[PDB]
Design an enzyme around this catalytic site. Structure first.
Site, mmCIF file in Angstrom:
data_model
loop_
_atom_site.group_PDB
_atom_site.id
_atom_site.type_symbol
_atom_site.label_atom_id
_atom_site.label_comp_id
_atom_site.label_asym_id
_atom_site.label_seq_id
_atom_site.Cartn_x
_atom_site.Cartn_y
_atom_site.Cartn_z
ATOM 1 N N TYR B 49 0.843 -1.210 0.000
ATOM 2 C CA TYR B 49 0.000 0.000 0.000
ATOM 3 C C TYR B 49 0.876 1.258 0.000
ATOM 4 C CZ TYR B 49 -3.676 -3.373 1.360
ATOM 5 O OH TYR B 49 -4.377 -4.569 1.476
ATOM 6 N N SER B 221 -14.320 -0.276 -4.833
ATOM 7 C CA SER B 221 -12.914 0.047 -4.609
ATOM 8 C C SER B 221 -12.041 0.037 -5.866
ATOM 9 C CB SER B 221 -12.318 -0.935 -3.594
ATOM 10 O OG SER B 221 -10.906 -1.001 -3.725
ATOM 11 N N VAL B 223 -13.133 0.851 -8.873
ATOM 12 C CA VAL B 223 -13.618 1.851 -9.825
ATOM 13 C C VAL B 223 -12.603 2.988 -10.068
ATOM 14 C CG1 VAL B 223 -15.239 3.794 -9.997
ATOM 15 C CG2 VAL B 223 -16.117 1.482 -9.763
ATOM 16 N N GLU B 224 -12.042 3.552 -8.999
ATOM 17 C CA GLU B 224 -11.068 4.639 -9.135
ATOM 18 C C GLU B 224 -9.767 4.140 -9.781
ATOM 19 O OE1 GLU B 224 -11.032 4.052 -5.025
ATOM 20 O OE2 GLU B 224 -9.107 5.102 -4.774
ATOM 21 N N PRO B 275 -15.720 11.143 6.431
ATOM 22 C CA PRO B 275 -16.027 11.040 7.867
ATOM 23 C C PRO B 275 -17.304 10.281 8.224
ATOM 24 C CG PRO B 275 -15.233 13.212 7.352
ATOM 25 C CD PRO B 275 -15.603 12.556 6.037
ATOM 26 N N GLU B 276 -18.436 10.679 7.652
ATOM 27 C CA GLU B 276 -19.682 9.997 7.974
ATOM 28 C C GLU B 276 -19.660 8.523 7.606
ATOM 29 O OE1 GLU B 276 -23.257 12.597 6.807
ATOM 30 O OE2 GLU B 276 -24.042 11.426 8.506
ATOM 31 N N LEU B 278 -17.082 6.793 7.648
ATOM 32 C CA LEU B 278 -16.191 6.242 8.655
ATOM 33 C C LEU B 278 -16.962 5.806 9.897
ATOM 34 C CD1 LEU B 278 -13.039 6.281 9.828
ATOM 35 C CD2 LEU B 278 -14.095 8.149 11.119
ATOM 36 N N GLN B 280 -20.334 5.404 10.157
ATOM 37 C CA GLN B 280 -21.330 4.410 9.788
ATOM 38 C C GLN B 280 -20.689 3.025 9.624
ATOM 39 O OE1 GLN B 280 -23.251 5.857 6.164
ATOM 40 N NE2 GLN B 280 -23.673 7.825 7.174
ATOM 41 N N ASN B 281 -19.497 2.989 9.035
ATOM 42 C CA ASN B 281 -18.783 1.732 8.793
ATOM 43 C C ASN B 281 -18.364 1.006 10.081
ATOM 44 O OD1 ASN B 281 -19.087 2.239 6.051
ATOM 45 N ND2 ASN B 281 -16.899 2.570 5.633
HETATM 46 N N1 LIG Z 1 -5.496 -8.811 0.922
HETATM 47 C C1 LIG Z 1 -5.812 -8.217 -0.213
HETATM 48 O O1 LIG Z 1 -5.503 -8.654 -1.311
HETATM 49 C C2 LIG Z 1 -6.631 -6.945 -0.199
HETATM 50 C C3 LIG Z 1 -7.079 -6.357 -1.456
HETATM 51 C C4 LIG Z 1 -7.966 -5.252 -1.378
HETATM 52 C C5 LIG Z 1 -8.340 -4.693 -0.121
HETATM 53 N N2 LIG Z 1 -7.733 -5.251 1.074
HETATM 54 C C6 LIG Z 1 -7.949 -4.503 2.364
HETATM 55 O O2 LIG Z 1 -9.426 -4.348 2.562
HETATM 56 C C7 LIG Z 1 -9.707 -2.931 2.780
HETATM 57 C C8 LIG Z 1 -11.088 -2.606 2.307
HETATM 58 O O3 LIG Z 1 -11.198 -3.098 0.926
HETATM 59 P P1 LIG Z 1 -11.369 -2.080 -0.284
HETATM 60 O O4 LIG Z 1 -10.953 -0.714 0.131
HETATM 61 O O5 LIG Z 1 -10.605 -2.562 -1.449
HETATM 62 O O6 LIG Z 1 -12.857 -2.120 -0.743
HETATM 63 P P2 LIG Z 1 -13.989 -1.435 0.120
HETATM 64 O O7 LIG Z 1 -13.542 -1.184 1.530
HETATM 65 O O8 LIG Z 1 -15.185 -2.115 -0.264
HETATM 66 O O9 LIG Z 1 -13.905 0.021 -0.564
HETATM 67 C C9 LIG Z 1 -14.868 0.962 -0.177
HETATM 68 C C10 LIG Z 1 -15.080 1.807 -1.471
HETATM 69 O O10 LIG Z 1 -16.493 2.237 -1.307
HETATM 70 C C11 LIG Z 1 -16.639 3.526 -0.793
HETATM 71 N N3 LIG Z 1 -17.264 3.503 0.520
HETATM 72 C C12 LIG Z 1 -16.748 3.349 1.789
HETATM 73 N N4 LIG Z 1 -17.644 3.408 2.758
HETATM 74 C C13 LIG Z 1 -18.833 3.614 2.080
HETATM 75 C C14 LIG Z 1 -20.138 3.783 2.577
HETATM 76 N N5 LIG Z 1 -20.519 3.778 3.869
HETATM 77 N N6 LIG Z 1 -21.164 3.984 1.627
HETATM 78 C C15 LIG Z 1 -20.891 3.966 0.247
HETATM 79 N N7 LIG Z 1 -19.607 3.804 -0.270
HETATM 80 C C16 LIG Z 1 -18.609 3.648 0.688
HETATM 81 C C17 LIG Z 1 -15.207 4.113 -0.700
HETATM 82 O O11 LIG Z 1 -15.227 5.425 -1.188
HETATM 83 P P3 LIG Z 1 -14.723 6.703 -0.344
HETATM 84 O O12 LIG Z 1 -13.330 6.439 0.197
HETATM 85 O O13 LIG Z 1 -14.819 7.873 -1.336
HETATM 86 O O14 LIG Z 1 -15.725 6.893 0.825
HETATM 87 C C18 LIG Z 1 -14.312 3.144 -1.469
HETATM 88 O O15 LIG Z 1 -14.174 3.493 -2.860
HETATM 89 C C19 LIG Z 1 -8.535 -2.229 2.034
HETATM 90 O O16 LIG Z 1 -8.373 -0.852 2.369
HETATM 91 C C20 LIG Z 1 -7.361 -3.114 2.415
HETATM 92 O O17 LIG Z 1 -6.854 -2.798 3.716
HETATM 93 C C21 LIG Z 1 -6.936 -6.389 1.031
#
Ligand SMILES: NC(=O)c1ccc[n+]([C@@H]2O[C@H](COP(=O)([O-])OP(=O)(O)OC[C@H]3O[C@@H](n4cnc5c(N)ncnc54)[C@H](OP(=O)(O)O)[C@@H]3O)[C@@H](O)[C@H]2O)c1
Ligand SMILES: NC(=O)c1ccc[n+]([C@@H]2O[C@H](COP(=O)([O-])OP(=O)(O)OC[C@H]3O[C@@H](n4cnc5c(N)ncnc54)[C@H](OP(=O)(O)O)[C@@H]3O)[C@@H](O)[C@H]2O)c1
Lengths: 319, 319
Positions: B49, B221, B223-224, B275-276, B278, B280-281
């Site tokens: 990362y 995730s 998409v960007e 933040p929000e 954050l 809610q999650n």
């Molecule tokens: N081991 C592996 O291979 C691997 C691979 C991928 C991920 N991971 C880990 O898992 C974590 C989470 O996975 P991820 O980040 O890929 O996918 P994710 O957590 O599903 O990503 C969340 C995506 O959805 C949005 N989001 C977040 N909270 C939201 C909410 N309450 N409502 C609507 N949209 C929301 C975010 O946008 P905003 O930021 O704009 O809010 C972000 O683009 C990673 O950060 C990483 O630590 C591990």
């Protein structure tokens, strides 16, 4: 007439062979003998099929009659799940050699990446799912690589010509390749239009690993075992896509099902209890499928797997 | 409430954590610090990362201000692919410890069952897909178990509390369990309604392995990242099944997607720049989905995977 495939070990393996799973011990030998008369030279067997003695009888009969010599026959066998512990690998192989009545097997595969607890051969053979504790499944902590090294030694001792693996998914084959001194020459997996796994096939071939498909006829082989999944599954023989392609070339659906694999460099081992199917199941290389043909058959791939350890005891081999 | 999960190593792991993937370097520290103020205690990071030093900055600030003590924070990191050779495992872990500014990490995982050729930290860090030869992928013959044993030694030396794996399919996890002395405490995998892998989850949990889901929001995730697949995928947030259930309970679709995993004993590590989102999650454990809810959501499983090494260089991890 049956093309040979040159394995990574340097030995040639016939691209078309005779499958021995579920050949009744009653007529197995006679049928192996007949297959030899019909031109088959590769015989795909296994310790768990419980009929290696009979396969050996057929081959020997053919050798004694002067129809073929040992070196013209390709014998494939497979190490069963109870024999993965290195100290038990050669024991199992010796039983296979004794049953087949030969000094070496041309190809020996790890049947499944599963290690059942060892059960002495004198207590029960073939053991099937028995793991020494009633009907309970019991496992041993023997990593794949340990079993593989024991096989490599057996190749050095001259008891095996080429070694390979069966029922291994991509991640596992990849890891084995990292530790293997003798690369697995063959990967034998369930392969038919309902379970195409094109990425697995592609990876293995590019890695120089030859593919042997089993159950090329899909659910067919399994309905006699009263398996619900196979029984609920529309046969490939009556499938419109396969029939249309068969009609198009004036060929049988069976021939299309086998050519579909053969044309892509995949070895086949059709099994049949019926004498008349012998010649038919090895004379199908008389036409070529087009890209469109392949695209139409590709639509049948639905990931339907008939031989799955998950059904036995939720063993996660394919998940 | 953020329930703790007792890992097979005896250590507790927060069932809800903060993902650090794609957290920008300039703000990562602040973001981690705010996360702590909002109650998060587990931070899912990784050498690849490239922001571990900043994640460490956030944690250190919260500790220096008195908001938490080191033992109250659960830091997860992952061994990138270029560092599987046993002799490079400790050097990679040491780079992670120095960046995070800690003496030990709470969880250290093998990021992928893939071994890229070693690349010195001084040459490029994090290396990403670079393998020391232009844009070519170059691999090392290092079996998973060798890497795992190197990790076991680091636990004994007290530099890691619990170890685990990421992106391991069933057959590979099974084989690792055969040679492991310290069993992998966690299996972190892509997990969401489009990729449910129910049998993998069941096997792992029955084996005593704790599941951490990543990318709980599916395609979002990625998409960007401008990934073709993710871009062409109807979102989970707008899927009628999820919308209906969210509406039914007056919860966001996001809250439903997280609870869906959590209620089944799966840990989540949602990542959010807002933040929000954050709060809610971390506050969605206020309702239970019903059996019917689960049955309806179960129907979405189409086996759609967004993080697949097959896309990098046709690496067969999931085939
Ligand atoms: N081991 C592996 O291979 C691997 C691979 C991928 C991920 N991971 C880990 O898992 C974590 C989470 O996975 P991820 O980040 O890929 O996918 P994710 O957590 O599903 O990503 C969340 C995506 O959805 C949005 N989001 C977040 N909270 C939201 C909410 N309450 N409502 C609507 N949209 C929301 C975010 O946008 P905003 O930021 O704009 O809010 C972000 O683009 C990673 O950060 C990483 O630590 C591990
Ligand atoms: N490694 C493994 O795990 C594994 C597992 C399964 C199979 N295998 C190997 O692969 C071989 C072939 O697979 P399989 O035996 O499962 O099934 P298969 O060869 O696909 O099955 C052929 C089935 O279709 C019938 N058949 C044969 N030729 C036919 C034809 N021309 N037209 C119509 N029906 C025909 C047979 O019936 P009749 O006999 O009545 O003609 C039999 O029921 C096995 O015998 C075995 O050696 C390996």
């Amino acid at each position: 007439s049956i093309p040979d495939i040159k394995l990574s070990s340097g030995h040639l393996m016939p691209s078309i062979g005779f499958g021995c799973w579920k050949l009744a011990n009653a007529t197995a030998g006679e049928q192996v003998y007949q297959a030899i008369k019909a031109g088959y030279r590769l015989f795909d067997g296994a310790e768990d099929y419980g009929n290696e003695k009979e396969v050996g009888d057929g081959v020997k009969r053919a050798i004694d009659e002067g129809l073929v010599k040992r070196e013209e026959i390709f014998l494939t066998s497979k190490l069963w799940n109870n024999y993965h512990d290195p100290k038990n690998v050669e024991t199992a192989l010796n039983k296979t050699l004794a049953d087949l009545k030969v000094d070496y097997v041309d190809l020996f595969l790890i049947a499944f990446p599963i290690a059942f607890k060892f059960v002495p051969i004198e207590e029960k053979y073939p053991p099937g799912f028995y793991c020494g504790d009633g009907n309970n499944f019991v496992y041993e902590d023997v990593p794949i690589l340990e079993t593989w090294k024991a096989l490599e030694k057996l190749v050095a001792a001259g008891k095996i010509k080429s070694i390979g693996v069966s029922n291994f998914p991509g991640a596992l084959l990849l890891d084995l390749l990292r530790g293997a001194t003798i690369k697995p020459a063959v990967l034998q997996v369930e392969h038919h239009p309902y379970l195409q796994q094109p990425k697995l096939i592609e990876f293995a071939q590019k890695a120089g690993v030859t593919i042997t498909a089993y159950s090329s006829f899909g659910p067919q082989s399994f309905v006699e075992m009263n398996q619900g999944r196979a029984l609920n599954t529309p046969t490939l023989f009556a499938h419109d896509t396969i029939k249309a392609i068969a009609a198009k070339y004036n060929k049988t659906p069976a021939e299309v099902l086998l050519r579909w694999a053969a044309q892509r460099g995949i070895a086949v081992i059709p099994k049949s209890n019926l004498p008349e199917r012998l010649v038919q199941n090895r004379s199908f290389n008389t036409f070529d499928l087009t890209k469109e043909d392949f695209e139409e058959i590709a639509k049948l791939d639905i990931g339907l797997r008939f031989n799955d350890p998950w059904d036995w005891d939720n063993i996660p081999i394919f998940v």
